[PDB]
Amino acid sequence: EKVTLRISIEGYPPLYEREAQDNAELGMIKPDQLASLNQALTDSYTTRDTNSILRSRMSVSYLKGYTYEDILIVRFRPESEIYWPISQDSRNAMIDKLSNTSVNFEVSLEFTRPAALKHSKSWLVPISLDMTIRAKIQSALRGDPGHPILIPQSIPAFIQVPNQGELTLPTSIGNTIINDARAWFDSLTLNLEQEKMWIATSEHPGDQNAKLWIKTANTTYSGRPYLQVVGFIDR
Numbered sequence: 001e002k003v004t005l006r007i008s009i010e011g012y013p014p015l016y017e018r019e020a021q022d023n024a025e026l027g028m029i030k031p032d033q034l035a036s037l038n039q040a041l042t043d044s045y046t047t048r049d050t051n052s053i054l055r056s057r058m059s060v061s062y063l064k065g066y067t068y069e070d071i072l073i074v075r076f077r078p079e080s081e082i083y084w085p086i087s088q089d090s091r092n093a094m095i096d097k098l099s100n101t102s103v104n105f106e107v108s109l110e111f112t113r114p115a116a117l118k119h120s121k122s123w124l125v126p127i128s129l130d131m132t133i134r135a136k137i138q139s140a141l142r143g144d145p146g147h148p149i150l151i152p153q154s155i156p157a158f159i160q161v162p163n164q165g166e167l168t169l170p171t172s173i174g175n176t177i178i179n180d181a182r183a184w185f186d187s188l189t190l191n192l193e194q195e196k197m198w199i200a201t202s203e204h205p206g207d208q209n210a211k212l213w214i215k216t217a218n219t220t221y222s223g224r225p226y227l228q229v230v231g232f233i234d235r
Contacts (some may be wrong), residue, residue, distance in 0.1 A: 001026060002111035003227040005227065007151070007188060007200060010124060015149070015190055015198045016080040022188060024217070029230070032216050038063055040211040041173070044180040052180045058172040060192075070233040075226035077219060079157045080197040095141050097133040098134045099142040099197050102127045104151045106188070108229065109163040110161050121167035123181055140192065157186050157213060159230045170232060177205070177212060202227055 003026070007016040020026055029037075041063060045056040085091045102123040111118060127134065136221035140147040160168045169182070186202040193199045201224075204213055216228040 001113050002075075002109075003074050003231075004107070004109040004111075005229075005231075006105075006107040006109075007190065007198075008105040009094050009097075010105040012094055014080070015084060015089075016200050018076045018079075018081050020074050020076050024220075025075050025077070025226075027073045029068050029073055031068065031216070033073070034068050034071065037213060037214060041176055044176050044212070046180070055172065055175050059176040062170060062172045066232050070235055072231040072233060073083065073214065074229045074231055076200075076228070077222075078200050078224045078227055080199065083197050084192070084196055091141055096136050098127070098138050098141075102134075104154060106151070106154055108159060108167055110167065110231065112161070112233070115163035116165075119161050119165065119167055121159075123154055123185075125179060140190075143192060143196075145192070145194065147192075151188040151190070153181070153183060153185040153205070154188045155186045155227075155229070156181075156184070157204065157228065158230045158232070160234065162234045190235065191218055199224070200227055201225060
């Protein structure tokens with residue numbers, strides 16, 4: 001079973017690329033994790049907001065439609081699997097294009113062991129025409145240390161894998177996160193950290209310590225947080 005995350009400027013080779021291949025990178029959800037997710041969704045309603053009750057119940061019953069062996073904890077190692085930049089990742093091309101519509105880019109790709117085998121989705125995030133912000137991205141690509149690449153609302157902490165075509169969102173859960181692509185997406189941050197690779201960290205919208213989030217773990221080998229996606233698989 002294979003899952004792949006790619007973060008890039010649209011049209012160019014990834015700045016960050018990592019596959020996740022039970023063990024640390026791919027595991028089923030633990031019963032305590034499933035329960036803590038459900039309690040988070042259940043208790044998310046405010047009494048005098050009837051809408052929040054409806055939203056929390058659509059969330060609770062969406063979750064109930066999955067056995068815990070259909071809920072994968074997918075963890076991507078934050079270090080890109082390959083150095084940057086090598087023969088050509090189009091560094092100068094990217095830098096020159098930022099100087100026009102340009103779009104940040106992340107893909108999720110899910111392979112399942114022997115329905116169809118391959119299911120994917122791309123998320124585009126328009127880079128502002130403000131040259132102030134495009135300058136910082138440029139010098140970051142130029143290998144200037146202490147210059148991160150911020151890609152807000154770019155990656156979902158929860159994804160749904162269907163038997164049919166492309167990946168979809170758990171929209172009810174997304175709505176619980178919003179009120180109680182979209183505003184509930186995690187934001188990515190890329191750092192070129194001194195043979196040279198980009199390293200990715202993510203942050204939830206709102207409080208990191210919100211109970212809804214299944215907390216990620218840190219890698220043994222580098223002590224860095226795993227990028228994490230929780231996947232709801234449709235059997």
